[PDB]
Symmetry: C3
Subunit: 252 residues, 3 copies
Amino acid sequence: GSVSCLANALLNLRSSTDYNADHGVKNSILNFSNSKDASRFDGSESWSSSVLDKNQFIVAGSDSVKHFVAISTQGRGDHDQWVTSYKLRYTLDNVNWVEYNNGEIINANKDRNSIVTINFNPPIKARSIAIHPQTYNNHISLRWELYALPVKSYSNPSVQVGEVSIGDRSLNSGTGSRTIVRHVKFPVEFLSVPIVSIGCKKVDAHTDNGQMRWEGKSENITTKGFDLTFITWGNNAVYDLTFDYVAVEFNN
Amino acid sequence: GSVSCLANALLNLRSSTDYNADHGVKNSILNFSNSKDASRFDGSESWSSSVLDKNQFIVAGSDSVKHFVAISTQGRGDHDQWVTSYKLRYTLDNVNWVEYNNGEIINANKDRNSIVTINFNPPIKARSIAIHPQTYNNHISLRWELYALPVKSYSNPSVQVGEVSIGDRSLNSGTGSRTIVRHVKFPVEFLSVPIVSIGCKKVDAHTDNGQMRWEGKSENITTKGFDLTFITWGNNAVYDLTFDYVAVEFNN
Amino acid sequence: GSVSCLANALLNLRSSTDYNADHGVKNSILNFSNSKDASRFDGSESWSSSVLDKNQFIVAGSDSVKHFVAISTQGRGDHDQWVTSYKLRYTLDNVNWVEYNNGEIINANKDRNSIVTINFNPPIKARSIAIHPQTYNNHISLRWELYALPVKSYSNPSVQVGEVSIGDRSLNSGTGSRTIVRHVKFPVEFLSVPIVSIGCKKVDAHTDNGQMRWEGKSENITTKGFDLTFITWGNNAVYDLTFDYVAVEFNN
Ligand SMILES: CO[C@@H]1O[C@H](CO)[C@H](O)[C@H](O)[C@H]1O
Ligand SMILES: CO[C@@H]1O[C@H](CO)[C@H](O)[C@H](O)[C@H]1O
Ligand SMILES: CO[C@@H]1O[C@H](CO)[C@H](O)[C@H](O)[C@H]1O
Ligand SMILES: [Ca+2]
Ligand SMILES: [Ca+2]
Ligand SMILES: [Ca+2]
Ligand SMILES: [Cl-]
């Protein structure tokens, strides 16, 4: 499953013109249908432009970088109007706009209800995308859907950073496996339990017959903090060790 | 304070049907009220559906993962219509939708103006959420607000990475505290001053009577770069040291 | 170029009141114009309020932190109405709202079509921003655009983390440049090739006549994983080494 962006209300829509508000982009979702009552008008089953020319469009946008894998278009559900061809333009940085496939005119609908779907390989990578109807039956009227790849579990992570040292002579003597634990509080509590990555930025340690032995481990990670377990073994004397840590929260 | 999402214009809204555009979701914010003039209609003080059945809804969405802590609903301000019960559905990945509390029918409004608030513990974690009115007085008409936790200071950070080495024999001789500074330019200038985290990925150093002594510090961090101060002391000779750095910008 | 936020459909808009849906915020973009046909009304070339008082507004919002560098306003294109002064309020956390320049009344339009632009130095840093018309000619009617800095290449990166060790005695003997490669699969495949940053969190190694020599390198990075090349040289015997890695994907 890809994501149906309009169905999920993921994108802002902006048309060039509307026939009136009862023909607005709010009425443009694929398969949109309203009351079948012939005595009261509740709006077109489509966006319909006001101006009929080759310069009309709907822009769809949001802040996220989307990978668009398809677009589907359909005509108007309640009257004989539909877009028969269009062009597509898009932008990643919202400053520089590009023409899809050098301004290819894409062949579109030929009736009220049949769905015509264009697939993108590779995906169009964009923050905003615009459909530009070029030809039409009766009126520039359409329904549509944009399909994007779902967001990855690893996207938009939250991050907190710090440093942690032994800070005393706890590991500076003795024999065999020896550890000390420093408890670290994150500056702010996370909403779920992060992972904690660590890297050494100071070693002050004595070899044991030429062998250096030191290790750091992040352990007992909660939303509030974690334990840096400093570890030596054999007969090494560790005077101090310092780690920077990067705590990363996913999915929140 | 939680965030009033509609008040702050944080979510796109999409209804199943509207009575017409003058009854659209744009009119649905909690406590919405317009001109009290009886001679001109400026729109309902509510969203109102067009179709009256058990299949109508408003979807609210955006790209961010929200933690919804409450929903409030209210009836229509200018006419005797209000939703008396509803269901809620939501989605995190915008592909898979779930029914809140196994499709619990929530008891809602009984007049025009009184606010009925449902609290979520734990918070509903979602990109999009849909209210599905089930029963109503007169018409499916509502006002509403969604309340989410505020965004954390640590969310959506910007990141730049690199590596930095001594690259010569500056630290390879001498006695006592000795340092050298390498200035590092970020590939692109940040908008505010980042933190810089560092971890060692190369040691080429001589012990001093068995003691190893090396340290790296990021210092003098600006929007443009920072100084990696490489440090040794006692009588160690450091031939080379290499750090990877992770520069993180928050709040921008 | 800064970003034209409304042109690019980047922000949700919410007005206090609309004269009706045919005067809604959907009609408010700078230079908006529709059919010049005098016989059919397709909507005002502006947002127009319904209530005329000092309490009307449009809020523009989305989840991203924007750096607003300018606002432009214009009157109504199709009738003699325009906003002659306004105030601005904004919010970063969507809980706490601030008044721009202590509630400065900004002098605005004096006709239908001329654009009046206010520049912000420093940029207003905000998730949502509201224009509050204070005085007007004929009606509270406006067109507008908000201009923000473009998003940086380094924003909203995706991140994956892990750890990698030699895990055997491959580097524990021998002379001269010696390496072993551990291949690392990311828990999930990236959409483009990430950078991989590394930091050491365990050293178990023997000096060679007092010299310590160890290095780690991330190499052959693909969307699926990378190689950690563990390196020693001279005559050092490395028993084990462990790195945490941070893989960062940009622009996706
Ligand atoms: C204590 O005996 C072993 O010595 C080895 C070096 O020869 C490594 O340091 C091992 O980790 C250690 O357990
Ligand atoms: C120079 O005397 C001290 O020696 C110690 C080892 O015994 C540590 O290395 C200290 O950092 C150092 O200051
Ligand atoms: C092998 O001879 C050299 O020895 C030096 C120490 O004196 C450093 O370790 C160099 O990297 C190494 O190449
Ligand atoms: Ca109908
Ligand atoms: Ca009214
Ligand atoms: Ca007109
Ligand atoms: Cl070391």
